[PDB]
Amino acid sequence: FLEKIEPAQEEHEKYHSNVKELSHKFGIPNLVARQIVNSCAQCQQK
């Protein structure tokens, strides 16, 4: 689970990539990707 999903977490931390970006770039569903963005504080706050 944290094999291919982890690398995606590092991608957001470098370019604040959105869910579609993480999912479309790596392949993880829109939910697993949103978890990365949801974890991001700078992105969490609107």
The CA dihedral of 9, 34, 44, 3, to the nearest 10 degrees, is: -20
Residue reference for tokens 């944290």? 2
Give residues with Cβ within 8 angstroms of 46, minimum separation 6. none
**Nearest approach, Cβ of residue 17 and Zn ion (Å):** 8
Task: Single out the residue of 25, 32, 37, 40 in contact with a copy of itself (rule: CB under 8 A).
Answer: 32
Check residue 1 for interaction with a copy of itself (CB under 8 A): yes
**Nearest approach, Cβ of residue 26 and a copy of itself (Å):** 13
Please report, as ranges, the residues that interact with a copy of itself according to CB under 8 A. 1-2, 28-29, 31-32
